[PDB]
């Protein structure tokens, strides 16, 4: 599959993924491409915030689908 994932800066990057790959690995792809530690990565697919132990199938991710690296801040 060829999926997309907009980073925190709007930059969208593609990935090599088979419906079998865990969320965990999807994150592993982004890092390899961008440098964003999977550790500080929070991916979200259609309101669902993907758990990195489940598979890309568990969320109905179909090729052309788009993921979203999001975040939440402590200050204010």
């Amino acid at each position: 599959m060829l999926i997309k994932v907009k980073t925190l800066t709007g930059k969208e990057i593609e990935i090599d993924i088979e419906p079998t790959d865990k969320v965990e690995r999807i994150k592993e792809r982004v890092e390899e491409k961008e440098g964003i530690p999977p550790q500080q990565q929070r991916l979200i697919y259609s309101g669902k915030q993907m758990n990195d132990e489940k598979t890309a199938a568990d969320y109905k991710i179909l090729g052309g689908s788009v993921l979203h690296l999001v975040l939440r801040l402590r200050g204010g």
């Binding site: 925190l8 800066t9 090599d16 592993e28 890092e31 390899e32 961008e34 440098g35």
Partner: protein, 520 residues
Amino acid sequence: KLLKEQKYDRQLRLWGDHGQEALESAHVCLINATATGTEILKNLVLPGIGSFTIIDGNQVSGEDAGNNFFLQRSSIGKNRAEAAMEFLQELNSDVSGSFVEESPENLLDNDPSFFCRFTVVVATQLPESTSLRLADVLWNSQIPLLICRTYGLVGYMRIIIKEHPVIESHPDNALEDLRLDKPFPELREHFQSYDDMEDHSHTPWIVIIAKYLAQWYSETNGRIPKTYKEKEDFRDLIRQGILKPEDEENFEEAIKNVNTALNTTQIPSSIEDIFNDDRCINITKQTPSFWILARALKEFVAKEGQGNLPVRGTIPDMIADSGKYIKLQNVYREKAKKDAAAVGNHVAKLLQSIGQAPESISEKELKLLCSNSAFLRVVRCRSLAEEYGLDTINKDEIISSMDNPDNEIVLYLMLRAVDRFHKQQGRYPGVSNYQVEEDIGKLKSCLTGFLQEYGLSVMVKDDYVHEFCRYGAAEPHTIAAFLGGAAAQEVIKIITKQFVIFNNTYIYSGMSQTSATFQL
């Protein structure tokens, strides 16, 4: 002196001392002290903008005081310019306030070259006519312009800087310049010194991957892990090397890092696009320090760079003994240093051929250009005349976005429709409760006349035509305050040449709470 480094600590941890100076010495001009204007200022004054001038030929109205935090009832009548200055003045004593009661149009006639004194021009709530004439006057003059608008719950912001180069782009996350794949003499020499152990678990992961990398380079003559399958088998090659299934967490760290350490040496696309730029290639006596550092960089990659930019010099932290990490750290800083020297050497030759003293560009500029060689960015903006010109309009962009009837670019179209309606009517849509009635019709007449004038086959739900009438050229404070913060940061981005500015046009919908950037 030292008292400032105290009230600015919070922003000094973002753009640094230099950022501040740059900021502290700029003189920004604001064109209308309406909420949007007053708020942008509010955000430039606080951080300590050098000085500012507020041009405006209006008199505060009832509504002007009911939505602006820098105009009390006490100032209704007094020129909206002078009025606003006072309250804004109070935010910072280190800032120099100044004002002009002459209208923006009036200065464009009487003294067009007036804006040649400003570092940046921020214009708010201007109608097409003046919005255009100014852009043209400022574009030629080489003056960075930021036009902002607040219409209902829609925030508009158009930046216009012919060329905005930037060295310190400030990337949020980025691939480490480790060079495990294309090691340099001294780096290879480092690994070579490590051997087969007392210090095992306290050895940096980089040295780990390195060592087992060399063991794979052998068995796999030449090849290097390139396939996810191969990378996996590499990970095991490292597992089987666990000294004593006892304690080796760092080995585990290496294993994890193998996902990124095996590919971190290649010239980024954006960088290449700069090398192949006409401004980098053909340097002249007019060429800017940036473009010269640009070439110097390229000349470096060709010769002693050997295909790649200068070694960054930095490395992440990693579980490892003290003395060791430090030495490894040293290997990278000394290398980084050497490369910087080389680049400078090219900069110098380069400078001399242009007819300039090598000391023309500082050593502290070169130090920076090198640690950021991989993050240079350059942002050119289409003029306002272009975006508006019949032949130059960016049709593709508009139509591709419009596939979604609710793609914020609609708001841009409606905004163009409103400005058109303005001319053809002398007034804005639905400002009165009785005007909303028919104005809803007369509007579309313009949304079409507009689209037609540019032959635009896009669908605009009539649901927007209403809304933009419901608005009634209203400048809701919360919507204004939004552009205030967003705009102001852009200005600081410019004044400090220290982050990457947005391209062309930015649109914010308070209704859905979403925004998008465009290139019109």
